[PDB]
Amino acid sequence: LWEAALTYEASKRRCWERVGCPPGHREEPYLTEAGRDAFDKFCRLHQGELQLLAGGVLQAPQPVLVKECELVKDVLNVLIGVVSATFSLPESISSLLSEVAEYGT
Amino acid sequence: KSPNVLLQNLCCRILGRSEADVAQQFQYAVRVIGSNFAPTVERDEFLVAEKIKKELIRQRREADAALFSELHRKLHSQGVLKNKWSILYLLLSLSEDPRSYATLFAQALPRDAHST
Amino acid sequence: AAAAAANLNAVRETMDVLLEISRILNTGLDMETLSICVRLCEQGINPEALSSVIKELRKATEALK
Amino acid sequence: PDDRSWLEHHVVHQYWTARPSQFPHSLHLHSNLAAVWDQHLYSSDPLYVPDDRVLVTETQVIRETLWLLSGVKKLFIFQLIDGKVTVRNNIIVTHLTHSCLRSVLEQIAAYGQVVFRLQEFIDEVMGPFRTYQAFMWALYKYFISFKEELAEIEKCIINTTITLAIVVDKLAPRLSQLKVLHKVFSTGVAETRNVVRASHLLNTLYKAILEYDEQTVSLLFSLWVETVRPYLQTVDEWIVHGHLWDGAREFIIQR
Amino acid sequence: MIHELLLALSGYPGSIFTWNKRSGLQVSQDFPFLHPSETSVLNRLCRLGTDYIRFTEFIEQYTGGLHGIYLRAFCTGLDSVLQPYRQALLDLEQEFLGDPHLSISHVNYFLDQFQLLFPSVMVVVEQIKSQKIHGCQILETVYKHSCGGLPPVRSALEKILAVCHGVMYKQLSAWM
Amino acid sequence: ITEAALVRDILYVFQGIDGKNIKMNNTENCYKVERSLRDTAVRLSELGWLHNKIRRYTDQRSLDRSFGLVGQSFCAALHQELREYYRLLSVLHSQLQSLT
The rounded distance, in Å, linking the Cα atoms of F90 and D139 is 52
**Residue E159 near residue E82 (C-beta atoms within 8 A):** no
Residues of A in contact with E2 (CB under 8 A): 19
CA distance B63 to F70: 28
> What count of other Cβ atoms lies within 10 Å of the Cβ of residue A59?
9
Nearest CA in chain B to E102: B70
Give yes or no for a contact between D87 and D111, defined as CB atoms under 8 angstroms apart. Answer: no
Identify all chain D residues contacting E89, using CB atoms and an 8 Å cutoff: 165
Q: Which residues pair with D86 in a beta bridge?
A: D79
Distance separating alpha carbons of residues E124 and E139, to the nearest angstrom: 12
Give F35's contacts (C-beta < 8 A, 6+ positions apart): none
How many H helices and E strands in chain C?
3, 0
Residue B109 near chain C (CB below 8 Å): no
The span from the CA of D163 to the CA of D65, in Å, is 12
CA–CA gap between residue E107 and residue D182 (Å, rounded): 38
CA-nearest of E80, E74, E93, E87 to E135 is E74
Would you call D223 exposed, middle or buried from its count of C-beta atoms within 10 A (0-12, 13-18, 19+)? buried
Sign, Cα dihedral of E125, E126, E127, E133: positive
- Name the structure determination technique: cryo-EM
Within an 8 Å CB–CB cutoff, is residue B78 touching chain C?
yes
Contact C10 A21 (CB under 8 A): yes
Please check whether residue A19 touches E, CB under 8 A: yes
Distance from CA of C21 to the nearest CA of B (A): 8
Residues E101, E38: Cα–Cα separation, whole Å: 15
Distance between CA A12 and CA A18 in Å, rounded?
14
Yes or no: say if B3 and B33 are a contact pair by the CB < 8 Å rule.
yes
C-alpha distance from E174 to closest chain D C-alpha (Å): 12
Residues of F in contact with B62 (CB under 8 A): 84
First to last CA, chain E: 59
User: For A12, which residue in chain D has the nearest alpha carbon?
Assistant: D160
Per-residue burial over C9-35, b = 16 or more CB atoms within 10 Å of its CB, e = otherwise? bbbbbbbebbeebbebbebebeeebbb
Resolution in angstrom units:
8.7
CA neighbor of D37 nearest in space, from D86, D121, D94: D94
User: For D29, which DSSP code?
Assistant: G
Interface test with B, best of E95, E99, E106 (most B CBs within 10 A): E99
Within 13 Å, how many C-alpha atoms sit on residue D199's CB side?
10
Q: Can you tell me the distance from the alpha carbon of D151 to that of D210, in angstroms, rounded to the nearest whole number?
A: 34
CB contact under 8 A, F71 and E41: no
CB atoms within 10 A of CB D166: 16
Q: Residue C36: name the closest of B94, B98, A21, A9 by CA.
A: B94
Question: Could you give the CA distance from residue D42 to residue D49 in angstroms, rounded to a whole number?
Answer: 10
Inter-residue contact F48 to F15 (CB < 8 Å): yes
H or E element, residue D10: helix D2-10
CA atoms within 13 A on the CB side of D65: 23
Q: How far apart are CA E164 and CA E143, in angstroms?
A: 11
Provide the sign of the torsion angle of the four alpha carbons E86, E90, E93, E99, taken in this order: negative
- Asked if the Cβ–Cβ distance from C45 to B88 is below 8 Å, we say no
Residue D248 CA to residue B24 CA, distance in Å, equals 106
| Phi, psi for residue F26 in degrees, rounded to 5 | -155, 165
